[PDB]
Design a protein around this ligand. Structure first.
Ligand SMILES: Nc1ncnc2c1ncn2[C@@H]1O[C@H](COP(=O)(O)OP(=O)(O)O)[C@@H](O)[C@H]1O
Ligand SMILES: Nc1ncnc2c1ncn2[C@@H]1O[C@H](COP(=O)(O)OP(=O)(O)O)[C@@H](O)[C@H]1O
Ligand SMILES: Nc1ncnc2c1ncn2[C@@H]1O[C@H](COP(=O)(O)OP(=O)(O)O)[C@@H](O)[C@H]1O
Ligand SMILES: Nc1ncnc2c1ncn2[C@@H]1O[C@H](COP(=O)(O)OP(=O)(O)O)[C@@H](O)[C@H]1O
Ligand SMILES: Nc1ncnc2c1ncn2[C@@H]1O[C@H](COP(=O)(O)OP(=O)(O)O)[C@@H](O)[C@H]1O
Lengths: 353, 353, 353, 353, 353
């Protein structure tokens, strides 16, 4: 029916349903569905629930201004939430990027912290490191988040959606990282271990965890890893665990102008001279040296990243080019039984496809 | 020394000191000095003090999103603070006004609520009504006010001024109205009085207070007087007092397009039919019928108003033209022993100078 | 003669001579006169001389693309020259700065490397540290510098100035740092000393030098000090000397967004835990705690900085505000016999005047 | 399958492969393949090879700033390379052409020297003159070419392409003309011949070569032929050869405003009065008087020319119109046994199609 | 006191009074004062008076849409009022003139009808012709004029000026021409006279009047004189009078492109062949041939014309240049006892000063 009334009717079926799909996309996102990870989705519902019952995510007192401790309805801290528009460069929305070079010393993209945060977790899972607490992109509305004067006043009047939902403040997008319990700043424990050495079996464990951290931080090329920035959990009377937690500043789009800037702080630790174990070599090498694994990972990051309103294909390629370079270096250092310290000394490479 | 080296040196004395004055004006304002009213200034210091000791002005739960209960260091509520940039139209700063007509149904100016608030108090004092709690333009900085993401992050780092002041968040300008104790919504009491009439002596008092309210609300042509909006204080075992408290929406720049919109809600009360007393006639008439009193008042409002960044001489004339018209009507109704109700029925006049 | 023919003639004396001064300013700068330091000026003449005789400054092979080893007519390396327009952000000349915020993660100004370079030397002298080899702002023309295609072709034809000078390529402005002989990367020596400890008297010397480095790097808040970046000279059969040499990335305009980025690399050395000596306390404290010394230094930097075409008063204040903050911290740590390591741990302060 | 799923899939086959073709076009060009002339391609590989082994094309000392002597890995000069962006008007890239007339005295196009250079060779081959050394459009990257500050710094970091190529500096496009050995400035020999006349047989040879030069220079209407600009090779104890070498300024788009400007310098030589031989008449006439030969040549030049980013169809027609006019004049002078001198005296014609 | 406090105070006397003068100029104009002609001013007051008492100027039924019959309070027609903004090209206010040539066939200025109207009267008086009824530039406000929707609604609300004037609609500027009684279309009478000739004495009178018309229409170069356009008053049982009444389209800025367009319609009448009398020659020649009279007249028109908001000095010169040309021709034809018909046949001249 190439030019017939039967087809022109079908084209109008598609037209109006595609406009129905495009109208109701924002509501579909703000629903927070994770078919692929029900355990996480549960914790989000729990977060949403305490919000209704009026137990509000509270600002983190000593950290940044942009991060919140999400509480469950009982009162327990269950997650950390960092909203996109509460990041430092949260303004500058009318993308002003193409106007700038058509620059600069900056090596990170402008306002995609929450996506770095989420992407770190995504690389973690793909590599099976389990050091980054599951963290995903999530919508949340709360009295305690930083809204604008207009946003607040608009929201005093009763509003209803249509499925007769009440509408509070506009939900903010951000990273929602699962909170983990009984951990401490890596350096706190690290210096105690210096005073008291650990039983060699336990210490062998700490070292396996630490290697995983190195791998993760090298691939995403974290910009901001201190030794206060990862966490160690350790209880004596016997397991020891690390948690990689502050990954808002990774996935740069070029290696920094000077090598000295943005160092990996763990590279100065004595642990860093210990050559990579076999355990890490056959957990990681089978993956990162398969071109399909890297191809598949790149695409996972593409999907996650595109979500952002400000997404730029040009940037994403630059970002991936850096990562490829890291993967390359890492592969080498893994094949030659080198150590984390050796790895950070290898000259940075970019790989263009 | 009209073109000599002795004078050219004196001109450079003036140049650099006038630039020193213009540099350090913002710090001079944010200091909150009131030579003319030390009692008020004291309460501001007290507000500033609790801020340092970490007793923060808290958001008013049931009212608007833009208003805060300032507390003293003890915990007592001492003032209401409404910041300019937390008003509904707080955005729209790059004055976009001349671009609009060179409009509209709107009869109030855009973002000068705090000045209406302050101006109401200023008219109160000039007329000696003492129904508006002293309220002035004040700078305050606090964790609990609504700042932007940038403003917050910028302020985590230690900053010092130079007289080695610490610098918190940037101080906000707004209205700072003295809080008054033991009052209730005018209509709460008003309906009780209907059930229980008041002793005629007390009732005569309520009526004197009420006349003052009428006068104030008519001259500034309040846009937003409900009967929940003014307050009555009354304790039995014998004085009764009114408080005019929510004057953010007065000093319009034209009479509203339709007379029916923005009514004075007290005009429907039975009290409003009672003709103006002698007490009010010789408290007000000697003032508002002296052209110099009005001239002097206009200039007080000019000085207060100009403070605003968005101030517009064109608007201020329109504003004053309306007020003159009200004063005119009021003068008439006062000379002819008319009642508040009669007064609100008189056709609105504008007076152009 | 306020409006007379005698004065109008004098005003024309000034008009045409001020236009003569403004015409011939560029030639006056490109002359490289240093009344205040004849020893340096000599070395510049020597550099200019080898240029004529065709001994060309050669590109530094392993470093950056923007730096040249200036040779005397004999062949000896006598200076390092880094031209402004060969810096990384050398383009972007039509100042596009005000168009950007009226940003950003960048904490250094755009294209003022040569001035940081020169300013470091200027702070050195003022404090009498003598660890930075004298370095000033200098004009040089050479075949080997990176010119544009036009600049090169234009310069094949014979040109003459008028004092019948020949004109080669257009002279470039940059930093001209005196070359120092027999030094090596600080870490080269530092690790040898670890194998072989130094005689305690010599080692006490190394420590006095090192303190000076700390002081310099903290005040200008160098962004880019590695342990390959300063140099140690040491000959055994007994003095030891440091040279602070790569100061192109100091005088930031804000403390970096994250404390972890741009660390001072010497802070990890064991030397850094040794508390500040008396020798440094009475060489520096008498200076940096006199408000006039700081006032005088600020003005020296102002004069040097303004030279740049892109200079911005707004930036320069931000820059000075940072430095004041450093001076403040430094003063404290010097009074309390603290160590360099303690000093870098003190929270960064900004001081606004 | 005009609107079916089988076809929509095929359209996506084309879409993504055409985008793959368009992505990887620049890499395809920078490869320098000449199926049609393997002997030339070889010399390019040889040039590329010495570049890797670090034998760099060196600047031509006495000529222009834009030309380089390409060396093979042995050290021998094998080619002359003139990059497009090192031509005099190499800037002005954002084509600013249509903005200019919607002018001027200029009769050559702005920045297509390398194409004139290449086109001269292309006309040579088509006419079988063999006086222009084979010269084609070629990409080359080298330390010694004139790059920008950014281009240089960007290229210090290791980069890799993906077929795991290393990436040096960005390759420049230009003309790559085969270097020819043992030649001298035409006038050098020409004046010696005046002192010593040549054996009449040899001299008859010189004259056949010279006619070919005339033909070539007249058709492309070279703008810049001196008598230092073509070369004669001559060895006594017996052949003599000319080489037409500097053809960067031909293919004008109009005849010059004044006939006197841009003369053909050989027209003043005594040789120029000698009428065209039969040898040239039946080598050239059979060609240039066949309309198909001219049609075919025009299309060869079209293909070569379009390569340029700045190409303009409007200009190319004007260019071809001039050439047609020359061909016309030339045909005439060839039919009537006229001499080169007669030919240059014939009034310039333009032929529009 | 050239730079003293005594003078700076006097300069502020001038500043604020000159701003007082400039503020209250519009009110000063809208007052309609004619010191120089009290008889006219009276009739304006009378017009204003009937307006208040609600006897409104009524639209002229058969003429243009822009003209009104002003009535006195009794009901008698006393004047014709043509408002500027009711002319055909009344829009186009934001002068768009300089944007047009930096054109055209149009030979009149855009929207200055009322000034032509007024200027005709002004030329009449200066020459003492007394055929144009006194007409001046006048402000009037009336319900019946054509106002905009906004103008009307704005004016329902009571407004007062400050000398406690009420404010009706905004007053319009226009021409206010005295109405004259018992006249008829010139051609009505003219054709009757053809049937009945007039007594020769009366006819001699008609001819003197007619000459005056010719003079007036030629000098201002009326564009639009029909024979219905001037009026004759004639009563039998003995004077006869003409009235020149519709002069809205004179003072062109160039002679029309074609001579045939805009003819003087009286030129076809038989009267027009009768040579100019002595009476007109010594009433006009003594004037128009004195250069000072013309100089003085030009300045009177300048003053009148400048009033217009759209006034343009460039145009006014062109206008005066045309008139000078007419005066020149007229002078000639008056000296040589020529007739009106001869005069209109003389080629148009422009005279530039
Ligand atoms: N997923 C997590 N589980 C447990 N503790 C966390 C987690 N994320 C952050 N923290 C802790 O909470 C605080 C939050 O700060 P962080 O998220 O690192 O950003 P910043 O310090 O820049 O605000 C830190 O003390 C950190 O140790
Ligand atoms: N100066 C004051 N003294 C005492 N009570 C006040 C004062 N101002 C406001 N209130 C009370 O506090 C609440 C604040 O609301 P208000 O200032 O009227 O603005 P909104 O209701 O629009 O937020 C009201 O309940 C009012 O009764
Ligand atoms: N003033 C100086 N005296 C002696 N050696 C120097 C001096 N400046 C730099 N060098 C040395 O020369 C090289 C130049 O590099 P440098 O100026 O540090 O910048 P980059 O390494 O970024 O090019 C380094 O090896 C350094 O050790
Ligand atoms: N293809 C070639 N073969 C041999 N010699 C050449 C060739 N091209 C140029 N030369 C010689 O090398 C020098 C290069 O200059 P040229 O290419 O003519 O441009 P310019 O003189 O404008 O730089 C000249 O001396 C010329 O004689
Ligand atoms: N000053 C005047 N005195 C007497 N009658 C007039 C006067 N002006 C106009 N009229 C008459 O009133 C009518 C008005 O028309 P007029 O002013 O000529 O312009 P239009 O015909 O274009 O509207 C005409 O009939 C004219 O005869």
């Amino acid at each position: 029916p190439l030019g017939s009334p039967e087809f022109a009717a079908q084209a109008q079926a598609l037209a109006a349903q595609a406009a129905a799909a495009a109208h109701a996309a924002q509501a579909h996102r703000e629903r927070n569905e994770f078919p692929e990870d029900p355990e996480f989705e549960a914790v989000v519902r729990q977060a949403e629930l305490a919000i209704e019952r009026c137990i509000f995510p509270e600002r983190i007192y000593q950290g940044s201004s942009g991060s919140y401790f999400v509480k469950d309805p009982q009162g327990r801290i269950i997650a950390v939430f960092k909203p996109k528009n509460e990041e430092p460069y949260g303004h500058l929305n009318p993308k002003w990027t193409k106007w700038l070079q058509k620059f600069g010393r900056d090596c990170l993209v402008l306002n995609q912290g929450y996506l770095s945060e989420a992407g770190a977790s995504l690389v973690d899972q793909k590599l099976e490191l389990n050091i980054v607490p599951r963290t995903k992109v999530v919508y949340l509305a709360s009295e305690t988040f930083n809204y604008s004067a207009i946003d607040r006043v608009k929201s005093r009047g009763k509003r209803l959606a249509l499925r007769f939902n009440r509408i509070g403040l506009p939900p903010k997008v951000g990273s929602f990282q699962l909170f983990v319990e009984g951990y401490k700043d890596a350096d706190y424990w690290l210096r105690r271990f210096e005073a008291e050495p650990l039983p060699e079996n336990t210490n062998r464990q700490l070292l396996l965890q630490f290697e995983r951290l190195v791998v993760l931080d090298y691939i995403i090329r974290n910009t901001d890893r201190g030794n206060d920035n990862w966490l160690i959990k350790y209880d004596c009377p016997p397991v020891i665990k690390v948690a990689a937690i502050d990954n808002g500043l990774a996935f740069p789009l070029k290696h920094p102008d000077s090598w000295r800037a943005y160092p990996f702080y763990w590279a100065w630790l004595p642990q860093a001279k210990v050559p990579f174990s076999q355990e890490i070599k056959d957990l990681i090498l089978p993956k990162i040296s398969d071109p399909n694994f890297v191809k598949d990972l790149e695409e996972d990051l593409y999907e996650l990243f595109k979500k952002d309103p400000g997404f730029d294909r040009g940037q994403f390629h630059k970002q991936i080019a850096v990562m490829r370079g890291q993967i390359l270096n890492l592969t080498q250092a893994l094949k030659d039984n080198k150590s984390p310290l050796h790895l950070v000394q290898m000259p940075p490479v970019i790989v263009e496809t």
